[PDB]
Design a protein around this ligand. Structure first.
Ligand SMILES: *[C@@H]1O[C@H](CO)[C@@H](O)[C@H](O)[C@H]1NC(C)=O
Ligand SMILES: *[C@@H]1O[C@H](CO)[C@@H](O)[C@H](O)[C@H]1NC(C)=O
Ligand SMILES: OC[C@H]1O[C@@H](O)[C@H](O)[C@@H](O)[C@H]1O
Ligand SMILES: OC[C@H]1O[C@@H](O)[C@H](O)[C@@H](O)[C@H]1O
Ligand SMILES: OC[C@H]1O[C@@H](O)[C@H](O)[C@@H](O)[C@H]1O
Ligand SMILES: OC[C@H]1O[C@@H](O)[C@H](O)[C@@H](O)[C@H]1O
Length: 705
């Protein structure tokens, strides 16, 4: 009925070789009502395939219970791509990286007895095969593979394992062989792929990720050349800038790939979207996953990038009959110039004329005709005679972003978060320090490390003008130090270095002194060899210096623990949770105070424009609207890095075109209209650092010229 195969040239769909233009759109980083519009714009962008990861931890929060409703409705998403007449590349994983919490793995998976992530491990294999098996079965049951008449033309198993296999050695090769054998053994009827897998076993095709992938070649001569990730920009991290990749560079890199035998490429990302809630983003990754994608975070067209790529795809589609019926033949044109010519026995001719010089514009002669090639550009001649397209020459409209305030300020109400201290009636205690994930299981960002310090009256610092010295070392990621219910200092880390040290003088009086430590995790690591084994939270050393005794090792004593916030267990984020009205309705009330809840009621602004929250007046925490988590906020973390002016021309790197530095890492936070009633919308903000609620504004996202 239907079939998907491959050869040395391309992917074969229904007996025909296909040059496939793909774009990556992750379903849980958007709302179910946004999906149709995003998929439509992708279709209009010239994409044949929609690519997406499958997010395990979002699907299986409990060892047994599954979730496939709301924006985690994977089956809804794929059927929507079908209704748009497009194909799907399903990158299953289960490891997805994706700047996604814990790399996509559920946190409970770590605590299954004898477990080891991404290796020749029995508990892992069982767990891995179970979920992968479930996903394939679900896809079959709704007839979603191309062989059944569905959109799914290929699937990915694992993500960029090559580098890990290298470091871990023999268990790595065994697991790879297993993973491949297992995946293919599921009889999907469609080919399987593996990115960054130089030794992917047959019949799995190894693919390429990166900014450029033209020099790439598969591990077998009978396997097609595929680029699973054309990085359209880079992710944003809290503390970091907003990176961008120029459209002219992307188009050049794509052209370099197509001209040189490349038959499949995928834009990572085509739509980046948002990291809603507290289980989406990876370690220190911002809520915004804009990625400088052709479709911005809010689903608006990122111009000129969208249109310029749309024109590129039109040129490739015009060149397609030749591309599938011939191979790339190189003819030198000059010192830094080449012509890749696709000449069919039928007589079809497509030519790509390149200029790799990034300094000067160059003129070449191809088949008696002159061509002017801008620096660092490729011209496409679909008929071999006339150049319809050039990668450095944008004929699409540019546009800027404006955030227009909608309505006015809100009447705010405030609730204080308690500062818990160690009691003798505490059940969850230990004679030392515990790791944060071990305790919280990522059910909350917050964990309280509590202990009591007894200060004898014969102490030296009490009689004279001396202060005791406290040193608290944490593995990450934010630490708040409270002595006797009062804040003594705050430290926070970076993505590269999340480990923390607090140091300072403390106010200790005679008797029992209570120490309260609040340890916050800002997402979990998603990449790295043995990344799951990395620590979070206060594990010491924890010392109290300046006593009659030299220095007291506070790590070696009884510690109480409390998971989450009193504000969380009371479920203050939802409307039915915000019932314990200990809310200060005060005309004059809470402002710039740590650990504070806020709530206001608003009406949905009149129009079609997408919405955000200007939170520049605030510090850090998380946001809910009508019970649904908008995600974390951290406008208090200012963007760091070198942010020079950049030219499209020349080799790109993540740091080449960085913007928004000396500014809040993220200021506006995406609010889907899909989440709003016409009136009586509940807006709950937990403010961890301290900020002014009256400053918070609802804004309208508009782009033009
Ligand atoms: C394109 O692939 C064919 C098939 O192997 C090969 O003979 C040819 O050298 C390739 N062209 C280039 C420019 O690499
Ligand atoms: C994890 O918690 C358990 C008790 O639930 C405890 O026995 C163990 O020491 C903890 N491990 C770490 C590394 O904190
Ligand atoms: O944006 C960074 C990207 O890095 C790639 O190597 C990975 O496959 C993606 O999942 C994403 O994490
Ligand atoms: O490696 C995949 C595994 O699949 C299981 O279902 C089977 O019981 C094992 O023998 C092994 O084949
Ligand atoms: O913060 C804990 C971890 O931090 C990572 O950046 C590092 O690669 C690991 O070795 C471990 O130290
Ligand atoms: O345009 C692609 C180019 O990317 C550069 O980073 C690389 O040094 C060149 O060899 C070429 O691959």
């Amino acid at each position: 009925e239907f079939s998907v195969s491959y050869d040395d040239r391309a992917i074969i769909i229904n007996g025909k070789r296909k040059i496939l233009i793909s774009g990556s759109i992750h379903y849980p980083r958007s709302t179910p009502q946004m999906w149709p519009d995003l998929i439509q714009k992708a279709k209009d962008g010239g994409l044949d395939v929609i690519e997406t990861y499958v997010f395990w931890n979002g699907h299986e929060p409990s060892p047994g219970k599954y979730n496939f409703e709301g924006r985690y409705d994977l089956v809804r998403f794929i059927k929507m791509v079908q209704r748009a007449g497009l194909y799907v590349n399903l990158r299953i994983g289960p490891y997805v990286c994706a700047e996604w919490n814990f790399g996509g793995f559920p946190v409970w998976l770590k605590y299954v007895p004898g477990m080891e992530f991404r290796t020749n491990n029995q508990p892992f294999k069982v767990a891995m095969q179970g979920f992968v098996q479930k996903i394939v079965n679900m896809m079959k049951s709704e007839n979603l593979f191309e062989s059944q008449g569905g959109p799914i033309i290929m699937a990915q198993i694992e993500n960029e394992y090559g580098p890990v296999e290298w470091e871990i050695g023999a268990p790595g090769k065994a697991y790879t062989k297993w993973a491949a054998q297992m995946a293919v053994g599921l009889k999907t009827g469609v080919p399987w792929i593996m990115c960054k897998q130089e030794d992917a076993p047959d019949p799995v095709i190894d693919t390429c990720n990166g900014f450029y992938c033209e020099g790439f070649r598969p591990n077998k001569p009978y396997k097609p050349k595929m680029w699973t990730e054309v990085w359209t920009g880079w992710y944003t991290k809290f503390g970091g800038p907003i990176p961008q990749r120029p459209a002219e560079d992307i188009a050049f890199s794509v052209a370099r790939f197509v001209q040189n035998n490349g038959s499949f490429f995928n834009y990572y990302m085509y739509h980046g979207g948002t990291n809603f809630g507290r289980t989406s983003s990876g370690l220190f990754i911002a809520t915004s996953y804009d990625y400088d994608a052709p479709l911005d975070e809010y689903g608006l067209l990122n111009e000129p990038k969208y249109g310029h790529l749309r024109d590129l795809h039109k040129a490739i589609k015009l060149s397609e009959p030749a591309l599938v019926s011939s191979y790339a033949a190189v003819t030198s044109l000059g010192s830094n110039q080449e012509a890749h010519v696709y000449r069919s026995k039928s007589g079809a001719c497509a030519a790509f004329l390149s200029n790799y010089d990034s300094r000067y514009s160059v003129k070449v002669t191809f088949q008696n005709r002159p061509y002017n090639l801008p620096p660092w550009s490729i011209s496409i001649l679909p008929d071999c005679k006339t150049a319809v397209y050039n990668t450095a020459q944008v004929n699409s409209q540019s546009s800027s972003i404006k955030m227009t305030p909608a309505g006015g300020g809100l009447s705010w109400q405030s609730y204080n978060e308690e500062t818990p201290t160690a009691d003798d009636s505490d059940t969850l205690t230990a004679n030392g320090l515990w790791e944060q994930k071990n305790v919280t299981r990522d059910s909350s960002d917050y964990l309280w490390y509590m202990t009591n310090v007894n200060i004898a009256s014969n102490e030296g610092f009490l009689k004279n003008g001396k202060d005791p010295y406290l040193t608290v070392m944490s593995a990450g990621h934010v630490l708040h130090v409270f002595v006797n219910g009062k804040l003594s200092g705050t430290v926070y880390g970076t993505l590269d270095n999340p480990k923390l040290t607090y140091s300072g003088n403390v106010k200790l009086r005679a008797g029992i002194n209570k120490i309260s430590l609040l340890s916050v995790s800002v997402g979990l690591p998603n990449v790295g060899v043995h990344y799951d084994t990395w620590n979070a939270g206060v594990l010491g050393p924890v010392t109290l210096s300046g006593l009659n005794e030299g220095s007291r090792n506070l790590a070696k004593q009884k510690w109480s623990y409390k998971v989450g916030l009193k504000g969380e267990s009371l479920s203050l984020h939802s409307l039915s949770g915000s019932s314990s009205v200990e809310w200060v309705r005060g005309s004059l009330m809470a402002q710039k105070q740590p650990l504070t809840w806020y709530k206001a009621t608003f009406n949905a602004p009149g129009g079609n424009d997408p919405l955000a929250l200007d939170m520049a007046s605030m510090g850090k925490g998380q946001i809910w609207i009508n019970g649904e988590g908008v995600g974390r906020h951290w406008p208090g973390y200012i963007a760091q890095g070198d942010c020079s002016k950049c030219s499209y021309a020349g080799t790109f790197n993540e740091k080449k075109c960085q913007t928004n530095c000396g500014q809040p890492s993220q200021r506006w936070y995406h609010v889907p209209r899909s989440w709003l009633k016409p009136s009586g919308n509940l807006l709950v903000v937990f403010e961890e650092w301290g900020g002014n609620p009256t400053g918070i504004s609802l804004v309208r996202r508009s782009r033009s010229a």
